[PDB]
């Protein structure tokens, strides 16, 4: 409070965290989307609104369209991001952005064109005196005390698995899968209409998020869970809706996160994320593979299902040579890790040259963030 | 020790030596436990 | 009540509470940074990332 | 216009027709087999070039 | 010879060519590719079939998942080379093989069992009469006219620099190098996704390849390209995609052929084309470099990017010596040169020794061919 404090802000496509330097615990966790009105208002004389923005939004479900501002982790509404931003600086911070400088992440394999936007509208409208970009994933590698490993980050958004050797990126061994946990949501929807049960709205796509986020877990083996679910009825739960009735979900358990390791369900190309660590690995030189192996760390929101470190180490281990060791690291805290890492980076003492000045950018435009940032 | 030394070096040459060692020679990397870093943590 | 302390505990959900208090029980950033030999060892890094970039 | 010849012809990609056109007015095959010295000249390489083999 | 001609076949890593010798042009040229379908047909009566193999399988991109036989210069699937063989042999062609002689080429350094296996293959169950395997850079320099010469070869597969010194390949001055056009192709896709377009399936891998055979040209300069297609837009083109969308190609035209010159871009860490042409030519003796400098010959499909030529004419002219003869030898039909050179090999009266008949397999087994061709 003495001094200015920077701002860590971690944007995905899901949730928006915001939290200040150096602190244990992001202050704001809020979902990331902007509704609007669809049903006629006649009540005058009281609280209306014509868009409702963060966890007032998803409050009042029943008379909105939620509508994400990020799409596969592009920004493709603006207006709704500054929205966005606007809500997170003033509603919940409460503090204004020009007296601080602000630190946002942002994935690895995007279009050029979005950072700067991030840049414009930053400098421009909110008045900052300076920012900087970092890649999500690099974060969590320095969250989790780890210079040197392969990480994964599975958003709601993007998928991405990135090896990083002595603390310093490697650009080419960066693979990219769009498979997230917004199309395990949309199958989870698709495959529970087989039972009976209906969602098709918006608020209906949160309640079957919710369902996932309750009652979901990964098999350790396909075949022998579902010979068990075809013997006994001891795989069924039962979940209570908003409105009073009870669904009884049963299999489809350990089908929706099985869409992760076989993408063929959903009709897509590409493998599962396992091969897919495995390739980003072969890409590397045979010398920092063996590094590479006992470094393995999982990060990001789906990446919570339970028992999903087991079936990883068992895939990854049938993929690896039987000479070579295999560690995965699961932290218990994965959700936020990346959010941690920011708030690592924000506290080094070196990290105060990384800054990009206004007035360097009032000199270079809008790309001065490619020569800027790496 | 100075011959023991000599057949080491020469054995990393990649020569057949039929020369056995009294006193073997043991390569560990070794690890320093760090607090920062986060345990593995699979069973 | 009309305090935003006592709406800030009445909005927000268990799980969120949840995971407050797990990530703020081990104090990771803390570990982290006060530990000497990790943080210089960033500092260093990040230093020849200035070196590097031009 | 029913027999195989048309056929192949509008399943051609345009790029691989125009490149038999150009390939077919140039005729390397003929004029390889035409001059003299050169052809027997190779025919005396892999002639003896057989005969150091067996 | 009089009442049959040997069929000249020439099966490169991504185009099979086929056709009778002496004549100019070879009958079928078709992708190398085999296709199965992913989805399931609910059609009674339309038919479909297993398998779709070359044209079929290319004009029905979207429901099929194309592989390759021929990976990286060695094949990995042989009983699809049975099937691709089977198409070239009875589809393409309509004639029996067991009543024509056969020609096959092959890279300059394969291992042994892969000619073993394809000389059982074609004894074994195609009855062929007479086979006769040839290298594949040889037959371009026969087709150039010429017997002494430095052959580079770059196709789908693999690229490779050989010497020939009348008629002889001298096996220690071989050079083998991993740039071949698949892996440009791949790295057009990794500089396509900068500007937002964004390709993941084997199906978009022809609409890549296809973008990438229509627009592109070699920078004489790198630097001055790049600061000249920073500061206008003339060296922007617009390419119409099936689907009706049309995409500004723009800068990296001229970025995806520079991974042959400098394969760094790609994460290799080994030299370039021209270094590698140049140690090549370092690597034999002093008395034929001076006739290996005024004579080099280009062949292969990778080979006919514009601009191709004055570049490696320059490249080539700054690690020679001193007042020193350089000439860089490049046919508008460099990558029909192999089969040309087939032809005519198979055309000459002393080249009926070099046929392998049936009882000599039946007595020797498939260890025959490398003692009978050397
Ligand atoms: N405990 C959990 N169990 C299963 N899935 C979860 C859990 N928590 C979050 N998710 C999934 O992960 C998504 C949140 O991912 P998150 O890491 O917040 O994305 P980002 O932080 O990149 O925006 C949610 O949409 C939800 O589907
Ligand atoms: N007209 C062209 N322009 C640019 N590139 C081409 C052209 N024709 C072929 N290519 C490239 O050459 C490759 C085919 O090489 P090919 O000659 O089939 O190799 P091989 O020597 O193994 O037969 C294709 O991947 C394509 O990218």
Redesign the pocket.
């Given at each position: 409070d003495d001094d200015i404090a920077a701002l860590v802000v971690?944007?995905?496509?899901?949730?928006?965290?915001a939290g200040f330097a150096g602190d244990d615990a992001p202050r704001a966790v809020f979902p990331?989307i902007v509704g609007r009105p669809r049903h006629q208002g006649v009540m005058v004389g009281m609280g209306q609104k014509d868009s409702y923005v963060g966890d007032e939004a998803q409050s009042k479900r029943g008379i909105l369209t939620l509508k994400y501002p990020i799409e596969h982790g592009i920004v493709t509404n603006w207006d709704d991001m500054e929205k966005i931003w606007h809500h997170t600086f003033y509603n919940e911070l409460r503090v204004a952005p020009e007296e601080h400088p602000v630190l946002l992440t942002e994935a690895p394999l995007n279009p050029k064109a979005n950072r700067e936007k991030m840049t414009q509208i930053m400098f421009e409208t909110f008045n900052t005196p300076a920012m900087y970009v970092a890649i999500?994933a690099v974060l969590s590698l320095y969250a989790s005390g780890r210079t040197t490993g392969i990480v994964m980050?599975?958003?709601?958004?993007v998928t991405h698995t990135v090896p990083i050797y002595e603390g310093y990126a490697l650009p080419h061994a960066i693979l990219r899968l769009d498979l997230?946990?917004?199309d395990?949501?949309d199958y989870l929807m698709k495959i529970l209409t087989e039972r009976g049960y209906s969602f098709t709205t918006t608020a209906e796509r949160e309640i079957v998020?919710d369902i996932?986020?309750k009652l979901?877990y990964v098999a350790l083996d396909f075949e022998q869970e579902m010979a068990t679910a075809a013997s006994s009825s001891s795989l069924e739960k039962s979940y209570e809706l908003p409105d009073g009735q009870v669904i009884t979900i049963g299999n489809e358990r350990f089908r929706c996160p099985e869409a992760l390791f076989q993408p063929s369900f959903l009709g897509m190309e590409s493998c599962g994320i396992h091969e897919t660590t495995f390739n980003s690995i072969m890409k590397c030189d045979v010398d920092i593979r063996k590094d590479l192996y006992a470094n393995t760390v999982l990060?990001?929101?789906?990446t919570?299902?339970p028992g999903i470190a087991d079936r990883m180490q068992k895939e990854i281990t049938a993929l690896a040579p039987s000479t070579m060791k295999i560690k995965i690291i699961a932290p218990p805290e994965r959700?936020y890790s990346?959010w941690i890492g920011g708030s690592i980076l924000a506290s080094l003492s070196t990290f105060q040259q990384m800054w990009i000045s206004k007035q360097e950018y009032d000199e270079s435009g809008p790309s001065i963030v490619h020569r800027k940032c790496f | 020790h100075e011959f023991e030394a000599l057949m080491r070096m020469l054995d990393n040459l990649g020569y057949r030596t039929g020369y056995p060692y009294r006193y073997p020679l043991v390569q560990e990397k070794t690890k320093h436990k760090s607090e920062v870093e986060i345990p593995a943590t699979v069973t | 009540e009309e305090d935003p302390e006592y709406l800030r505990l009445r909005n927000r959900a268990a799980?969120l509470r949840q995971d407050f208090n797990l990530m703020e029980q081990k104090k990771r950033v803390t570990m982290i940074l006060q530990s000497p030999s990790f943080r210089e060892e960033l500092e260093g890094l990040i230093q020849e990332q200035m070196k590097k970039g031009n | 216009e029913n027999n195989p010849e048309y056929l192949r012809e509008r399943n051609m990609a345009p790029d691989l027709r125009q490149d038999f056109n150009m390939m077919e007015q140039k005729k390397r095959v003929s004029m390889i087999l035409q001059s003299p010295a050169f052809c027997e000249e190779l025919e005396s390489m892999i002639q003896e070039q057989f005969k150091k083999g067996k």
């Open positions: 971690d944007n995905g496509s899901g949730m928006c965290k990331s999500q980050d599975s958003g709601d958004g997230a946990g917004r395990l949501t998020r996932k986020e979901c990060s990001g929101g789906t919570m299902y959700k990346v | - | 799980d | -």
